[PDB]
Design a protein around this nucleic acid. Structure first.
Lengths: 50, 15, 82, 207, 38, 103, 206
DNA sequence: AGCACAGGGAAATGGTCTGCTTATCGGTAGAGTG
């Protein structure tokens, strides 16, 4: 039973409504269900986290 | 106006 | 791209007019989409005015990632910018 | 007759100034001569210009790494392959690293091929007499060109995080580039006046 | 619409041949101060 | 033969407007024109940029471009800031030769 | 009148094409965050926009007073000789007659002023033109100061020469366009603010 | 046997600027001769 421990990346988009102190708890749960600086997408307002 | 990128500072969002 | 240290930053310490326009527009757009407001409201209804009054108090939680021509960049807080 | 003598004197003094500018040694007596002194020192009894004595040479002043420079005025009005081979032989005989050949009317293309043929051994630069009658670097429009050493070029590039291709360019065939003997890759710092800032420093890479 | 738009067009395209080629030859200070030597 | 107004610094430090005789030609031959005895070879100027570039180099070419652009623009009495003309000249001379503003 | 109409109808198209060509050639040239002007390929077009790094909107014409003054008048307006001159203390709340260190400061000041005048008259504006667009209308700021503080021409001032020298030097040190501890950054900063420094030193001589 | 009407139909001759394609032509270079 070969199990591999690997480092992976994902790009999470977050709504401005969540931009508060609990931002990072929300991202971790979303990552588990499915942290870099948040890039605010021009013209949309979301924040991209790697 | 697009010669730079905007990011969130979470250090401030904590406080 | 390599991030420059806070002490090594060589760009201007002032907010450029383009930076000010972009910051106000981005914060106003985020407020219009129900982003929590980090300033006391006296009945303002326009998100742009709310962002302006946040800026006056340096309460906009945003950074500016200024890119140098070679690709290295400096992150400046909207609060620390003059 | 006299016109040719004065023209060659002007070109010869300009060549001396050119040598002094590149960093080679030229005695102030050589720089500050006069037409009559040139006539005495280079013309025979009949005043016929003797093109054999028009050649001279100079040593580096502050950079011993540079080799000796040799300057010769073509005896024949038009330089050919024969004279090009003769000049290369003269350069090799005395171990002159740099050599400038000044001709009067024209130079053949197959003769020019010899310059590329021996580029790895000697650096040969060709001038026409008319190109040296007047020193262009003394013109008002020409700002102050200064060759930068490799250390200073590296400093500039690193400070601006530049690549050599991203600097402003100066052509190898540029009159001032030929006057200064610029090779490809060398950067010149050009100091200029400025209506706005008073003084300005531009930097041009030879390309 | 040499001066004006035609001259600007000549400058901008780097015309190898221009309508009015000219030189401004400045004489030496002692020559330039006398009409006969000029 | 024309009489041009030149400005020169008197020995006492002030500037005076004197008169100097200048020769304005038709047709350009700059390199031979400078070599003529009696002409100030340090001031001879031509209104052709290719000629200056082949004779005097690229920095002199940029200066000549600027002078002729300003002559064209300011003849009417108007004025453009030096920055715009200088940027146009630097773009047209950046790569070592005259880049024509054309296809 | 027919010729005028024809000229209009042709010149419109001529200039339209010229402007499109001009914009297409320089559309990509932009000021970067290190002060340099570069095109989309990163090629440096200028090392400082306008050679001084200033917005053309904010500049105003200023007159260089020291340029057209004679050497005698320049000395009269700028040379201070406490050994021979005593009228300075008549204008001051504090006596500085026959003071050595103050005279040394004044001598350094005047040497710098003479160097600046030499550079102006010989290198920058040999034609003797004095009115040039510079940042900040310093004369207007001086007039504003005279009006705001009700400066009485008959009231002796509490300003010492050292105060003026130190203040002007600190101001000049605070006119930062380029930032960096390197050598060529210092050189480019000095070059960029050179003309403004000359004007400031000519305006705020002791 | 002459026209609808979709199938089968193309023909009498009536500004300067750059880069390619050709003629031109030196300057040597063989030696062919002596």
């Amino acid at each position: 039973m070969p199990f591999f421990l690997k480092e992976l990346s994902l790009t999470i988009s977050l709504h401005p409504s969540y931009f508060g102190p609990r931002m990072q708890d929300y991202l971790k749960a979303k990552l588990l269900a499915d942290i870099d600086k948040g890039r605010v997408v021009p013209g949309q307002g979301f924040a991209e986290f790697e | 106006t697009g010669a730079f990128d905007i990011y969130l500072d979470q250090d401030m969002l904590m406080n | 791209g390599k991030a420059v240290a806070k002490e090594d930053r060589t760009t201007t310490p002032y907010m450029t007019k383009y930076e000010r326009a972009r910051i106000l527009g981005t914060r106003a757009l985020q407020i219009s989409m129900n982003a929590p407001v980090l300033v006391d409201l006296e009945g303002e209804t326009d998100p742009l005015q709310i962002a302006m009054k946040e800026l006056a108090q340096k309460k906009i939680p945003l950074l500016v990632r200024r890119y140098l021509p070679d690709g290295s960049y400096e992150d400046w807080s909207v609060a620390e910018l003059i | 007759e006299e016109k040719n003598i004065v023209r060659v004197f002007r070109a010869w003094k300009t060549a001396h100034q050119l040598v002094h500018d590149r960093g080679y040694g030229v005695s102030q007596a050589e720089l500050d001569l006069t037409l009559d002194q040139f006539k005495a020192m280079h013309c025979g009894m009949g005043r016929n210009l003797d093109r054999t004595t028009l050649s001279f040479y100079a040593k580096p002043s502050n950079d011993s790494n540079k080799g000796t420079i040799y300057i010769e005025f073509a005896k024949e009005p038009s330089v050919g392959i024969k004279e090009m081979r003769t000049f290369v032989h003269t350069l090799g005989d005395h171990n002159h690293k740099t050599g400038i050949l000044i001709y009067a009317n024209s130079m053949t293309p197959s003769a020019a091929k010899i310059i590329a043929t021996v580029t790895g051994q000697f650096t040969i630069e060709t001038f026409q007499e008319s190109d040296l009658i007047v020193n262009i670097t003394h013109h008002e429009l020409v700002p102050k060109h200064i060759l930068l050493s490799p250390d200073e070029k590296k400093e500039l590039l690193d400070r601006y995080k530049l690549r050599e291709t991203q600097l402003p360019r100066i052509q190898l065939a540029d009159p001032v580039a030929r006057y200064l003997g610029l090779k490809r890759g060398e950067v010149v710092k050009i100091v200029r006046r400025s209506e706005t800032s008073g003084r300005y420093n531009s930097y041009r890479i030879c390309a | 619409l040499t001066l004006g738009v035609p001259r600007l067009k000549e400058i901008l395209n780097v015309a190898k041949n221009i309508k009015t080629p000219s030189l401004t030859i400045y004489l030496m200070p002692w020559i330039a101060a006398n009409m006969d030597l000029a | 033969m024309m009489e041009h107004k030149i400005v020169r610094q008197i020995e006492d430090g002030t500037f005076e407007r004197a008169d100097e005789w200048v020769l304005e030609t038709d047709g350009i031959n700059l390199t031979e024109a400078m070599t003529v005895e009696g002409v100030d070879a340090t001031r001879t100027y031509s209104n052709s940029f290719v000629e200056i570039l082949q004779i005097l180099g690229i920095e002199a070419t940029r200066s000549a471009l600027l002078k002729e652009l300003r002559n064209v623009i300011e003849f009417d009495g108007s004025y453009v800031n030096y920055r715009h003309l200088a940027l146009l000249c630097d773009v047209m001379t950046s790569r070592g030769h005259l880049m024509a503003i054309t296809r | 009148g027919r010729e005028g109409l024809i000229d209009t109808a042709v010149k419109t198209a001529e200039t339209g094409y010229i402007q499109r060509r001009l914009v297409k050639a320089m559309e990509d040239v932009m000021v970067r965050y290190d002060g340099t002007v570069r095109n989309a390929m990163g090629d440096i077009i200028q090392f400082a926009y306008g050679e001084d790094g200033l917005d053309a909107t904010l500049v105003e014409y200023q007159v260089f007073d020291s340029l057209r003054l004679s050497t005698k008048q320049f000395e009269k307006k700028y040379r201070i000789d406490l050994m021979e001159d005593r009228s300075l203390s008549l204008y001051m709340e504090n006596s500085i007659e026959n003071d050595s260190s103050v005279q040394d400061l004044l001598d350094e000041e005047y040497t710098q002023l003479v160097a600046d005048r030499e550079l102006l008259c010989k290198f920058i504006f040999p034609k003797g033109d004095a009115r040039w667009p510079l940042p900040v209308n310093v004369q207007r700021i001086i007039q504003n100061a005279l009006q705001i503080f009700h400066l009485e021409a008959k009231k002796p001032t509490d300003l010492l020469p050292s105060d003026i020298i130190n203040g002007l030097n600190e101001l000049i040190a605070k006119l930062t366009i380029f930032r960096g501890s390197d050598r060529i950054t210092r050189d480019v900063q000095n070059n960029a603010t050179l003309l403004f420094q000359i004007l400031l030193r000519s305006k705020f001589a002791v």
